[PDB]
Amino acid sequence: KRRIRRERNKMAAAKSRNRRRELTDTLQAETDQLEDEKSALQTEIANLLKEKEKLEFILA
């Protein structure tokens, strides 16, 4: 009974620890990316604005 279950549960403890390592590794790595994407839109926005003004002046 035990010899069966103990090795059986050994696998579960292993598999669960497995997922938490990956859940975090993934969220961590994903937020790293989303951070960049955001960061770049902030600069894309800054530059778009400078162009917007510049053109309005050409229409001054």
Binding site: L27, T31, L41
Partner: protein, 57 residues
Amino acid sequence: RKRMRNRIAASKSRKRKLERIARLEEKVKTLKAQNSELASTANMLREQVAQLKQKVM
């Protein structure tokens, strides 16, 4: 004692691993939003420039 002190660590160690997971989940959430909104403003702007580039051309 040796066991009792160590319990306290194992406990603390589990908690850290738990939190990081939480924090991340939170960060992912807000990022998706801010990140999504700035995209919209990015589009209101891309087109307006496209338009003005024409009016000036």
